[PDB]
Ligand binder design. Sequence first.
Ligand SMILES: CN[C@H]1C[C@@H](N)[C@H](O)[C@@H](O[C@@H]2O[C@@H](CO)[C@H](O[C@H]3O[C@@H](CN)[C@@H](O)[C@H](O)[C@@H]3N)[C@H]2O)[C@@H]1O[C@H]1O[C@H](CN)[C@@H](O)[C@H](O)[C@@H]1N
Ligand SMILES: [Cl-]
Ligand SMILES: [Cl-]
Ligand SMILES: [Cl-]
Lengths: 261, 266
Amino acid sequence: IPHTHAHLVDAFQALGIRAGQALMLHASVKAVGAVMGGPNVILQALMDALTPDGTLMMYAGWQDIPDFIDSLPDALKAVYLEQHPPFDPATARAVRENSVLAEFLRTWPCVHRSANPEASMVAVGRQAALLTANHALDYGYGVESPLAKLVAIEGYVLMLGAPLDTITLLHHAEYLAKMRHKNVVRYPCPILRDGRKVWVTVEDYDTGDPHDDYSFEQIARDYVAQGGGTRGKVGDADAYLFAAQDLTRFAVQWLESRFGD
Amino acid sequence: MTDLNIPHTHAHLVDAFQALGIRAGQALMLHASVKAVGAVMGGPNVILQALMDALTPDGTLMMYAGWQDIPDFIDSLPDALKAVYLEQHPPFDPATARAVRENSVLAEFLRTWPCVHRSANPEASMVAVGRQAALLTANHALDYGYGVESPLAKLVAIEGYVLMLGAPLDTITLLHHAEYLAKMRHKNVVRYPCPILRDGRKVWVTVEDYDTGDPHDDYSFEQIARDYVAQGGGTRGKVGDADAYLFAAQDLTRFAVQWLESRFGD
Ligand SMILES: CN[C@H]1C[C@@H](N)[C@H](O)[C@@H](O[C@@H]2O[C@@H](CO)[C@H](O[C@H]3O[C@@H](CN)[C@@H](O)[C@H](O)[C@@H]3N)[C@H]2O)[C@@H]1O[C@H]1O[C@H](CN)[C@@H](O)[C@H](O)[C@@H]1N
Ligand SMILES: [Cl-]
Ligand SMILES: [Cl-]
Ligand SMILES: [Cl-]
């Protein structure tokens, strides 16, 4: 008895999903268990609960981003600079980890994808263009980003069996928080400009390691423990539903009270 | 979005600990987030009381304390300021030194308990109550505080357990003992100053240890533990509102050492 479309819709609504919401999804397709019609039915079920007036977004990134070329032998780097393809939002594949549904969402009609290669987001639904447009290359989790806009339209984050450590929105809280010190990274990336490949330097806060003695798992568990969000079962997966505005405010205060200057 | 609970009772915490697998006479190291458990009838001390009730007086309960105010950073200060720290900063006083800032409410509660014992190493300080509290905390060397002369080594040797109570597995102090034990291609060795009490007087000493602030290679503690649970390490169960985990110290240490050595070892 694999989970049916209807069964998942009702579990989404029991958790708190409602028509018209803008939401960002993090999922582990494995944790949900078998679904009748396969993993795409998870998305169809979710968009059914959201209705066409709602919006669904996921983090895609770019699996093949060649941001490591400086650590290669000079001779190999030269080959990358000539032969590695640029970020193409039409065909660039999503990061491997917890992303089967993101790759699925990229074949949906009317999908939008933001232009920042490393921080690329995909979205479908009413506010999909708004969320994804004019995504700055530098500080791609900052003020000119789909995360900033998700907070601004009072959207949500849904964890569908995905670990609390993987909440991309918390990088936006890192961006906002006034902290003693934040690590800056500067790395190369080929992109399309007027149809032609150009390599640029991208500047960003480091998102590979926390800027201080904390983890996102820590912050999220502290949030849930003080009453943040709702928790519930969806298929076989443990699910959480958070308000983006409230989570971001909580996380910024959390970081500023422990690591401010 | 989720309302607070009707307070958990002592009795219902004892039951939950027994259902998790806590048994009389065990020696336990506890990692807890008090808020994860939810409201408790009587406050956070009842968690400790219920756990010791599950363990009986024949059991032992240990937690990591450390020293929140350790002035181990004073070599990175300008000369004049460093001189002020050297003259004015208090020494580590086991009686009053406060535990590190996070997940330590219960460790701080443990320090007001009668018959509590505190190990002597300031940065790696452990607190314990119960039958083997003295044995576990005895003769904790100042150098290599997570090594052979540590409460963690003794916890493994007497085949104790580690109990997660809503704390991230990231924070299992025992994993620093695994780092000590593992033969790895690269290790960071640090020397830092610390004021202690010798014969009632403040004296500054230099402590030598492995760096425990950064990993010695490309890994994180969350990696190792998540890999440990994924392959069936320990038992799981609810305690109050918290998701709990119960590990055998010996098994987790062996796993984490093999984990490190297979990736970075000889
Ligand atoms: C041993 N003295 C210093 C030696 C020096 N070589 C270290 O760099 C320095 O560590 C920095 O401070 C850590 C805070 O943990 C950061 O590590 C974190 O960084 C994240 C992401 N980057 C993860 O890598 C990792 O999980 C860590 N949580 C490090 O950048 C040490 O001091 C600290 O560690 C002492 C012992 N525990 C404490 O007593 C001190 O109060 C002080 N916090
Ligand atoms: Cl997945
Ligand atoms: Cl997110
Ligand atoms: Cl705590």
